[PDB]
């Protein structure tokens, strides 16, 4: 289905290697909350994307907290792949649909 793959990395990971399935590939550097909210709200108007795969290069664990909160407030599943966003948190909430590794 419509899945968005967003990566916040400093390591050089390019984008070209990345019934109705569509995939979104992007590369991001900054990790401030306003940027996250703006990007999420912009892509949410982009053809009804249901899938969100995210990873981070920094080691800040509040990114996963904000991702879980936004997933709950949008009812959209989100994954954690790398960095502070993939760090295992304390206690998820049934209202939330955020999942990690």
């Amino acid at each position, epitope marked *: 289905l419509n899945i968005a793959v967003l990566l916040g990395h400093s390591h050089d990971v390019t984008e070209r290697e990345l019934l*109705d399935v*569509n995939v*979104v590939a*992007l590369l991001m550097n900054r990790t401030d909350p306003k940027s996250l909210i703006t990007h999420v709200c912009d892509l949410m108007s982009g*053809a009804r994307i249901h899938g969100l795969v995210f990873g981070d290069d920094t080691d800040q664990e509040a990114v996963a907290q904000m991702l879980d909160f936004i997933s709950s407030q949008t009812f959209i599943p989100i994954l954690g792949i790398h960095g502070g966003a993939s760090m295992i948190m304390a206690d998820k909430d049934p209202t939330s649909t955020f999942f990690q590794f």
Partner: antibody
Amino acid sequence: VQLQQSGAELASVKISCKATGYTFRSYWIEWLKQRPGHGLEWIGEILPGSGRTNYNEKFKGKATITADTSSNTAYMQLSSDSAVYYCTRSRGTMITREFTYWGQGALVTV
Amino acid sequence: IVLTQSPASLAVSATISCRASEYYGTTLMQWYQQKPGQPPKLLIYAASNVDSGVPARFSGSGSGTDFSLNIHPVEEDDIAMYFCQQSRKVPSTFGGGTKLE
């Protein structure tokens, strides 16, 4: 896939749009206005599978769209405008969001 | 998004223009052919890729907010109205129409 609609009209009205070529619970249904003198417009879409509905700001509060999962029909109600109407369905491959299957057309007049 | 195209009427024995008021390297513009008394038919998608099952005489190009359409050679088929549609933001909007003779 073929589409059928109601007849002409001449207050409030209701127009039916019946599906007899596919699984009616999978694809969205969109309504179009084609008043003569210009190209076209866009009203709203409805998904019979779950019932999620979105409406256009210009036509908000004036057009109500409903569907029946049993008879596979689409109902659009305009309350309290003389134009030709169309109900259509996309191909399903998505992204492009184009219109391929077209109805017959119901001519309403006041 | 508001679209505007000229000329409203064209006299040939040709080309078309549609200027807008992109999505990560993808252009969102489609051209429809509508004979009198018939439903519209999609002709070009992504502003650069033609539709399968259509004559090769049609080709298009454009980027940003200025896109154009041209046809060669000229035959009896291109005798209807045409328009351009955007999909970068919901709801979509179409053109103003363009005859041919």
